[PDB]
Amino acid sequence: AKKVKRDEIEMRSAQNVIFPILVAERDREFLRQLRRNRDEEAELMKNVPGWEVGTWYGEPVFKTLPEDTLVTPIFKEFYAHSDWKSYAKRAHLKLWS
Amino acid sequence: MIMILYWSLPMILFILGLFCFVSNRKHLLSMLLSLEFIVLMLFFMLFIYLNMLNYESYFSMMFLTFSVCEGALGLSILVSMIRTHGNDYFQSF
Amino acid sequence: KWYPDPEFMKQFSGPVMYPDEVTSLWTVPPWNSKVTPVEKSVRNLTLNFGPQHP
Amino acid sequence: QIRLLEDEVRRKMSERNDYQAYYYRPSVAKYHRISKEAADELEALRGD
Amino acid sequence: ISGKTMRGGPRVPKAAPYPYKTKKYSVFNAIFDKTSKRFDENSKVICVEGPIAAGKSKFAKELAEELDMEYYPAVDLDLIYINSYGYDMRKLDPQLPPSCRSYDVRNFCLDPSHDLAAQFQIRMYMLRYSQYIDALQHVLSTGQGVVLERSPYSDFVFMEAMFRQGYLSRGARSVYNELRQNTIGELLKPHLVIYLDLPVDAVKKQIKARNVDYEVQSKVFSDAYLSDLEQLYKQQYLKDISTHAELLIYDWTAGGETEVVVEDIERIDFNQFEADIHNKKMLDWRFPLEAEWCEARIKYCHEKPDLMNYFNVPRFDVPELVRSADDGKVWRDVWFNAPGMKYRPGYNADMGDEGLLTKTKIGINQGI
Amino acid sequence: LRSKYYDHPDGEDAFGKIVATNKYAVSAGVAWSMFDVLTLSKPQGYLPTLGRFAYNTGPLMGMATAFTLTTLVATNARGKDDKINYLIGGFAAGGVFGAWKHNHVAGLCAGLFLGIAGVIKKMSIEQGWEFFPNTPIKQYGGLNIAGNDWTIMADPPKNWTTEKPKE
Amino acid sequence: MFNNSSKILFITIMIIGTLITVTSNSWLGAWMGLEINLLSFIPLLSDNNNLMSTEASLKYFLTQVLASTVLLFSSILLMLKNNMNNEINESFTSMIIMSALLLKSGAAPFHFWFPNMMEGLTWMNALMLMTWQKIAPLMLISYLNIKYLLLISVILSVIIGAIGGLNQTSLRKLMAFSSINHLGWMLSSLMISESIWLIYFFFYSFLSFVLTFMFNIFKLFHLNQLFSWFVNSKILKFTLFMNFLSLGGLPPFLGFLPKWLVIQQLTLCNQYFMLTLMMMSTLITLFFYLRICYSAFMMNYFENNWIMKMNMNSINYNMYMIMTFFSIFGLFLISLFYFMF
Amino acid sequence: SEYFGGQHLYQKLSMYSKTLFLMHNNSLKIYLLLFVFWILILLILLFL
Amino acid sequence: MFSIIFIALLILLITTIVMFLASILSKKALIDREKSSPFECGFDPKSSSRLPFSLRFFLITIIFLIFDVEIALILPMIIIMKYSNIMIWTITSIIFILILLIGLYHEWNQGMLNWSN
Amino acid sequence: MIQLMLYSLIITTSIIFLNMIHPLALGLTLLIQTIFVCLLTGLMTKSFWYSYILFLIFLGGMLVLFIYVTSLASNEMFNLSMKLTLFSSLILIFMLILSFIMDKTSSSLFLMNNDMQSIINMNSYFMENSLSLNKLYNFPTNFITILLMNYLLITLIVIVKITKLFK
Amino acid sequence: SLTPFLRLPLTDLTGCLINHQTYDKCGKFEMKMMECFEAYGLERGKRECADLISDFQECVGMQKQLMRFHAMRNERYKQWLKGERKGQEFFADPPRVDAY
Ligand SMILES: Nc1nc2c(ncn2[C@H]2C[C@H](O)[C@@H](COP(=O)(O)OP(=O)(O)OP(=O)(O)O)O2)c(=O)[nH]1
Q1: Could you give the CA distance from residue G8 to residue F161 in angstroms, rounded to a whole number?
Q2: Would you list the DSSP string of B24-86?
Q3: What is the CATH number of domain B2-92?
Q4: How far is the C-alpha of I51 from the C-alpha of I66, rounded, in Å?
Q5: How far is CA H15 from the centre of its chain?
Q6: Are strands E146-148 and E45-49 parallel, antiparallel or unpaired?
Q7: E110 CB under 6 A from ligand 1?
Q8: With an 8 Å Cβ cutoff, are G39 and B73 in contact?
Q9: Residue I115 belongs to a domain
Q10: Gap between the Cα atoms of K29 and K33, Å rounded
Q11: Domain presence at residue I69
Q12: Per-domain residue ranges for chain B?
């Protein structure tokens, strides 16, 4: 068991080293994609009765949050302009599409 | 509509279960089996809610442990009832 | 003096004190209200064991 | 006279439910705080 | 079931008997004390039957004497008329003549034409039935065997017998016949039944030897009446007992040799009958667990009042069974104003009780 | 569909008015219908069942319409809104009750009864009270209602304080 | 605690299960407690000694199980679409929860199972269903706050609850109908306030408890049995039977004290019309109780002949008629009760 | 007078007492069906 | 998962195809009144032969369910043991098993399997 | 697609369930339903842990009672009707082609499988059941498990009290 | 959470039965609420938790946010049905899988 704990911890120690690099290259794409995602939400409801991007016809979806508070969009919203091929490519990876 | 696209299927099944629970059957076994289907649907509604919840998920066991006990009690009284009258047939009621 | 007489006690004593075509029809007054079960005949299962049998 | 006053006050105190008395329904965050504590207890504990 | 003679001595109770005569039994008490622990070989009920004037009281006395059971003397109709200080309410003359004046077996034998006879005809069944529960009480508490000379199960024989003679009413026959079911379901049938079989003439020989100024000179003793016992015993009464209890039939008591009867009974064992439980014979005695033993025990050591209250059956459709209100009111006045009936037994200090002003005790199933 | 009988003058919008009543009439009609078709009539088949539902519902439509129109007729012509107006309203309703029931006496007596009902109803409408007003008080327990806790978990301090802001 | 030792066990588990409900924090916990009640009660109700007990068991189980099924289901919906146990307002999400609870406690439109039950139940088993199997669903009804449904229940909680009682000759069914009427008063009282509802149920528990507890004692199961039941004097036949009028709560019987309390607070809410209806029906409730008391008010009736003595348990009788004496002279304790202020 | 109240009331009560017994002299399927219908009505009205 | 799902569907389809194939490969014979009777060692079957359902096998399977559910309760102990607080995980689990033993040993003294019938 | 196909299969089997009246045919129908519901809840869950669990309790053990006591058999075997099968096939297919048509995403649940959680989530990189089943054993929410086991103990005390009616 | 009337020692089992708060983004909103419910009771608090209940519900409930998407994508389809969107423009670009 000492040997099993030995190598598992090594994985976990090697694990922590890697992780921030993934997060770093992760943040850029999140902000890049959000920029584009807001652009399309603006450019697709050009002619809509009262559309207000990031809200529901006026009132904000969230209000108790102070201003300049970024709330990550739910997964579906993040994919609001995407095909199944994109959607499944991440969703059905446990199931191995 | 959220419920119409998400919580609708559980409704339609649940109502169909109840109607079969109040239909006409030679004995009560079809009834017990009917409510048993309802339990599975009951689990279905329960889990999608517990899935809204990060860790409250575990409450499945509580519901499952209780539900199987209802079924066991259900079969308990029925089987004792055949043994009493030599039958548990709805004509005896 | 009039005292409660068997006629007055027969006012009640049906399954319904105002008996109707059905309640007056069938009556089930087990006084004790604890009716003993009556044993049935539990016929057993029959096996023609053998001849074709090791 | 005092009885009429009591009813009037009881009318107001029920309408608004200001005061922690007959027309109050105390709530409890204790159980949520307790679960908050359990979450705290086990976060620091994670990992051998 | 086994005789002392083959024991080379007396039988012993396997465990300390429970004072059921003077102590109440509780469900708490059942948890605190087990039931079948005391039970032994002889824990069984040997009922006797025979045509009237068969002298079986001496037989059963000796049989219980040399097999170590209880005798439990026969019907004692007088006990209705007896009290804490003995005297007969029959003493009370026909102040209230119509349906308050007494009726003993003497009165029946002198005249069964009186509708008031039906009174004891059912009250006599109750006395048997109450005795039977006493026997079950003694069994389940002490574990000791019992022997009842006659049983409520057998009482209907005389019932249909008297009715066939015409003495009872068509109404009364229905009343008793349906009413048996109500209570008779709630008793355990005896393990063993011994029936004695003389012909009608032969019993007339012996009843003329009883020399009883209220029987031997009486008129009821037609062959038809004393024979109806024979047919009813032979088929109607026996068969159901023949289903449950083991049935032995010797010729009769007089030639009935006790020792061979002792040996024949002892030869008939019941470990042989410890086979499949579902067997209908001995059926009413298959108690699975000690808990179920205690259920039967508590049901008789703590529910005798419940057992009596089954008798509360409303039937005001039979005149002879109805009582006149105001006369009945006076009948209440006589009984509870008469000596030694004002209070509960032991509290009739008018008739002598002392130790009152502090006494607050009451006996298990103490009458009232 | 959605109208109120008693939110308009007592002589205007007959059609909207009857609708605001007929809805509260049909509710009772079909409500009793499903209640009794399964108890007594039990007429096997769907047309027979349609018959019982029709038999039950129509008369209550007759009651409501008769009451409404007679009383509406009164205000239109009698020119007043009185307890008596609803009284003739109730008389007409029970007259329809006798007509359908084919029991002359039963209809007339109920017509008197329904007139009393309308009388009291008008009294509510005009005296500013109601049969089932909302509650002014709703109590939740004794004065120590806050003090009836018997729990045995230690509660760490709160995240909120009653004390005034210190900024 | 009727015959066996297991009676104590199942009663205990039952108590714990129901106590969970009344102390339950969330709907799910309350549902949990309710099912535990469902378990613990079925074996007591389903005696293995007779038949009628067993048929009552399927009906009780086959009804309660559906009630719990619907209750939890409607809970999820409410506590989905509102994402919170205490919805902002009562909508269609919530009426179903009451309809579950009303059936579980046997309220007005959902009652038919409840009379059919009584045939099977013995006395104290009936008693125990009468009193305790109605706490939890009612205390939950407290949390639900739909005025109109309770009001329709209260309207219909006496009409059938008394009209049927007029018709029944089996004491088992009469107690059913008697309580459905009384249940009408609890439901209204709980719509008004809870402290008064708590009191009224308790006095109802007390009264029903003593009532059926003597019927158990003497095993009187049919109006004929009441007329025929021997008593030495035919005076205590009458002294004991005052309680049948304490059912109606006529002032010198202590049943008035709760009915007065509910009436006082209810009219303080100004639902005068509702009081009139319930209180009109109360007379019909008291009507058949006099129909019962023809057995004892007059004395010295026509009786059966064979009985000579009447007997009963020490423990049950000793407890019983202490409770009766209070039902006789209870009012003068006006001071002793201080929970009304 | 007494016909308007009096005995006639007790006459009509017996009529309705008989009726309620006919309701209650049936099979448990019918009553559960009532409840199912009551549920079903409320469910669709939530949707509507 | 659905990789598993598809494989199972494929197998089941191949399975039924094989048995479907054997159903055509095996030669047919003209049916016979007696060839299609229940086998009772060559002596005529009795009346319906539907066994009595007065028996214990449901009782044993009910013991199964109780222990089968209890097994469910104790399954997750493997993973949580690394995370949970040790006192609670220790005592909580220990009393599970302890109560099981006591239930078992108490029940041997009851001896419920040694029924009279 | 799998999710909505699985709805379709559950719908079709449900229609099968409400038609079939032979007890085995019903009990068979439950069996299929259970596999389907286990599949479906698994998809929307963090993992299939609970699916395996309720499979072996509900189906694996507890439906054995239902089939076994419903071995009454009707005294005779099925008269299978190829028509309801064909309708079952027919209803399945155009539901299936509609499933091919329906909106790929919006017709899907929104729940967060382990994959559909964000990458940054440091908690998600543990054993999939570790953090979910944590508080089933850790205080003060673990005593309820003790209540479960004693409930099951009491359940057996009940079964031997009901299943022991004189035999 | 609806208030147990008696609050006896057996609320101690199910009160913390299942908690929104722990390890939940909505949990922060639960605390923002449940403190106020403690401050204003359960009836005045239910009156004066407008924003608190709105956001708490929105976080877990996702009603407002999710329904915004549903109309948002329906409107994409609606223009396609009117024919504005053709085989290419009918969908946008795929987010890099390593995002979100
Ligand atoms: N009406 C009626 N009389 C009975 C019944 N059983 C017994 N008797 C009457 C008939 C007898 O004359 C009398 C009892 O006399 P026995 O013949 O029993 O005296 P025996 O020599 O048998 O000894 P013993 O009575 O036991 O002391 O009581 C009964 O069931 N109904």
Answers
A1: 48
A2: --SBSHHHHHHHHHHHHHHHHHHHHHHHHSSSGGGHHHHHHHHHHHHHHHHHHHHHHHHHHHS
A3: 1.10.287.3510
A4: 26
A5: 13
A6: parallel
A7: no
A8: yes
A9: no
A10: 6
A11: yes
A12: 2-92
